Design a protein around this ligand. Sequence first.
Ligand SMILES: N[C@@H](CCC(=O)N[C@@H](CS)C(=O)NCC(=O)O)C(=O)O
Ligand SMILES: N[C@@H](CCC(=O)N[C@@H](CS)C(=O)NCC(=O)O)C(=O)O
Ligand SMILES: [Cl-]
Ligand SMILES: [Cl-]
Lengths: 212, 207
Amino acid sequence: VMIKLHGASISNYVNKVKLGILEKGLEYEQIRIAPSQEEDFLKISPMGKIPVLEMDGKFIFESGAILEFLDTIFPQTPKLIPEDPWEAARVREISTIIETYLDIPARRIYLAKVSPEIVEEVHSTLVKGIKALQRVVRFSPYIAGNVFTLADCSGFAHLSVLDEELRPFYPNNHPLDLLNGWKEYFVFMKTKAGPALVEKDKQILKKILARA
Amino acid sequence: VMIKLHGASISNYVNKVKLGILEKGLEYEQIRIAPSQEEDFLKISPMGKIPVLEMDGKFIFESGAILEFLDTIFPQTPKLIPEDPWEAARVREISTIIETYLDIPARRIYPEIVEEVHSTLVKGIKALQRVVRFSPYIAGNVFTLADCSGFAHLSVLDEELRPFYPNNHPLDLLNGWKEYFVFMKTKAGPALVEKDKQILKKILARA
Ligand SMILES: N[C@@H](CCC(=O)N[C@@H](CS)C(=O)NCC(=O)O)C(=O)O
Ligand SMILES: N[C@@H](CCC(=O)N[C@@H](CS)C(=O)NCC(=O)O)C(=O)O
Ligand SMILES: [Cl-]
Ligand SMILES: [Cl-]
């Protein structure tokens, strides 16, 4: 098999890549591993992170570099980076906002310390990010417009997890509730085979790990 | 000219963009502003950050999206993203490591967490070592987007952390860095970027 994706289905960054692979209809195998600082893994993934893409004996790490690479070598539909450069920028903006300004903050919670205050700081930071995000998304029906893009890979993978993770922390208080279109979008994406499969694989492994 | 770069030379993310604009030989004006949460600014820059690129009455924010955009509309050498797709992945990897795994953590310093931070940086520095070539540029033999992130962020990290790790500096573990820094400073673009930063620092230099 040409493409190997290293990383388990519970990782939202793994799932971001997986969504792009599935949507293009590429053939691949997922190799379920956990992160690790063993010298052997560091050789292919310097920070000990997943996902890692393996292809042609070469390894690419970092979900963003991976998806940009796949879109370059496998330009078949959908184009994760639109050909129009302005729309490409919007796609890249959306994805950066989601990962950098929403998920990074949220990980301080759902991954440490507990403080109503700490929790409080995060609530404010997320509300700020959500409001920024609102300005660039279209959900018509995809997050950046009328076709699947990189932004849907980041959006579906991260926001689905952010949504589940933060309900415990924020009943009546969830930041996403402020993102107009999120719920419709999430339901829409779940009517699709790729996103549905990504959710299923996550659920399968979660149920299994829970029996630790 | 047809391009305006919004943000002062104090910001490493602004300097990242500036390096790429300079290296492409593009006509531009730099608008010296600070970041802001003023709604009128949030309209063109949702997170209220600098830099913001403006062209054709339209705005792009996020230094990564801006340089990928300039690469695409001004595709002439130097190509910020290599034509070879593996080399292009290397470039994006280097840039992401520098920003996410070195700069972000470093920003927790500019408490006594300075020790947990020093370990994070040695780790990030050790990972970076695995992908850089410095031959002479950060990713290889030509200027790329990774040089925009590398020169903008590393220079800052180095000076900014000397007063915290006099004999302890993690960036000293990065083989080839000092020579790269020196080499980059001989080029007209990085030299201008570095001079504007230095002027601004001498100027607002009041302890
Ligand atoms: N920026 C990285 C993030 C990857 C990441 O944080 N993955 C987690 C998912 S578990 C991980 O491998 N963590 C292990 C670690 O940080 O050591 C990417 O885009 O791939
Ligand atoms: N991810 C952004 C980072 C830009 C950034 O953090 N700029 C700083 C430089 S001062 C800023 O505008 N901070 C103001 C703020 O966060 O409100 C990028 O790559 O452009
Ligand atoms: Cl799995
Ligand atoms: Cl300035």
